[PDB]
Design a protein around this ligand. Sequence first.
Ligand SMILES: Cc1cc2c(-c3cncc(CO)c3)cnc(NC3CCN(CCCN)CC3)c2[nH]c1=O
Ligand SMILES: Cc1cc2c(-c3cncc(CO)c3)cnc(NC3CCN(CCCN)CC3)c2[nH]c1=O
Length: 134
Amino acid sequence: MDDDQVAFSFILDNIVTQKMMAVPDSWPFHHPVNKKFVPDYYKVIVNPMDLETIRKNISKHKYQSRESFLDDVNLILANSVKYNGPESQYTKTAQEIVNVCYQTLTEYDEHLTQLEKDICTAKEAALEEAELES
Ligand SMILES: Cc1cc2c(-c3cncc(CO)c3)cnc(NC3CCN(CCCN)CC3)c2[nH]c1=O
Ligand SMILES: Cc1cc2c(-c3cncc(CO)c3)cnc(NC3CCN(CCCN)CC3)c2[nH]c1=O
């Protein structure tokens, strides 16, 4: 419940909604696949991912650094490559979602590094506090 984790999560939620979800024709990736339009989806894809699941994860503060966040963004691209193939319009769009995500992280690199560094410090400060109690 530290202010650095709250600020970091807030930044990630903003990148998702304001930049990634704003990618033209990205709407099929904004929510989990609807099994009606794609009956064999969950047979083919073992680990499904979408922009809504990521926002729910951000809300639960799953991501303490941009790397675990990147693992879930990259899983969206790899799922599209497997299910629709590399030539698919769905994969080209998934790739564009990934490119804008990396671009926004690059643009906010110093802010994010500082927050990641502060989240790390708060966790270490919490453990030394639980040792001074005796
Ligand atoms: C069939 C379809 C759905 C859809 C859904 C959608 C689909 N399923 C569920 C839900 C709700 O939970 C939403 C969401 N946004 C769409 N497109 C808009 C078009 C205008 N864009 C801005 C352009 C600015 N000049 C932003 C995206 C969609 N376009 C579609 O063709
Ligand atoms: C995210 C996604 C959606 C999608 C939707 C779709 C569109 N509107 C709404 C909804 C509701 O979720 C889904 C429809 N057809 C897709 N692509 C085809 C499916 C058949 N494939 C052959 C596989 C044979 N084993 C070739 C590519 C989709 N592929 C996707 O990756």
